[PDB]
Paper text:
Based on the obtained X-ray crystal structures of CHS, CHI, and chalcone isomerase-like protein (CHIL) from the same monocotyledon, Panicum virgatum, along with the results of the steady-state kinetics, spectroscopic/thermodynamic analyses, intermolecular interactions, and their effect on each catalytic step are proposed. This study characterized the enzymes involved in the first two committed steps of the flavonoid pathway, CHS and CHI, and the non-catalytic protein CHIL.
The bound liquiritigenin, the product of isoliquiritigenin, a type II substrate, was surrounded by 34RGI36 from β3a, 44FTAI47 from β3a, 104YAGKVTEN111 from α4, and 147SI148 from α6. In addition, a hydrogen bond was established between the sidechain of Lys-107 and the C2′ hydroxyl group of the bound liquiritigenin. The overall structure of SbCHI was very similar to that of PvCHI, with an RMSD of 0.66 Å. The noticeable differences between SbCHI and PvCHI were observed in the loops between β3a and β3b and β2 and β3a. In addition, α8 of PvCHI was shorter, as the C-terminus of PvCHI was more disordered than that of SbCHI. The Km was 16.55 μM and 1.585 μM for naringenin chalcone and isoliquiritigenin, respectively.
Residue numbers in the entry: 3 to 213
Write the structure that this text describes.
Amino acid sequence: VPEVVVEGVVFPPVARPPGSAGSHFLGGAGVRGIEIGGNFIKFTAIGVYLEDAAVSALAKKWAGKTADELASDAAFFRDVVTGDFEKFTRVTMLLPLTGEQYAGKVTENCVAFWKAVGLYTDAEGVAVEKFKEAFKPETFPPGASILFTHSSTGVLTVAFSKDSSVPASGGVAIENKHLCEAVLESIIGEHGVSPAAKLSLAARVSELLTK
Ligand SMILES: O=C1C[C@@H](c2ccc(O)cc2)Oc2cc(O)ccc21
Ligand SMILES: O=C1C[C@@H](c2ccc(O)cc2)Oc2cc(O)ccc21
């Protein structure tokens, strides 16, 4: 597949996460903004990479479905988020943000959505602290990156980079499945904070489930 660029940030078509040797391809890459008044104001550039073994797993169900057929099924996005494979996500800052300020928003969409469904156990609470701790001493000038590694077993790994480059040596590893998927679920889920990314991951992945 081809490279996807999001507002200058250049997400290459393949990438090996920090601490991994397998190859991941780029599922999709879109912008995240919020609605200041009435304007779409861009803050981050997100890319979602999926392990190569993922094409087989998803194709079991989604082969031959159009880009819009895939783009409209919340299952295609739940499958990806919770797929029994590895997922690598890079968040690149278009606007300046601080780790303390990034992690807060992510956890309040989670530790809230878990209280909406009664799944905010001492697990989530502990995972979100270790989460909110890895981000606290960091500030992300535009160009820096946040790199999450989602494992098949639900093990989140939080690396950082000064630029769009994925570092060689890994980061922290929060050993909780919900918080792992919550992070990804919050980017390309039903309430995904990046529908552009969903659009890219729907278009690209549809052209691979026909080959
Ligand atoms: O205007 C914003 C930006 C937003 C924000 C910070 C970081 C990030 O990554 C994405 C959004 O913080 C907010 C919180 C709010 O309740 C309402 C508006 C905003
Ligand atoms: O690149 C994008 C994402 C795109 C988008 C928004 C919402 C949605 O549901 C699907 C796509 O909207 C935008 C609006 C803008 O002014 C600038 C960039 C974009």
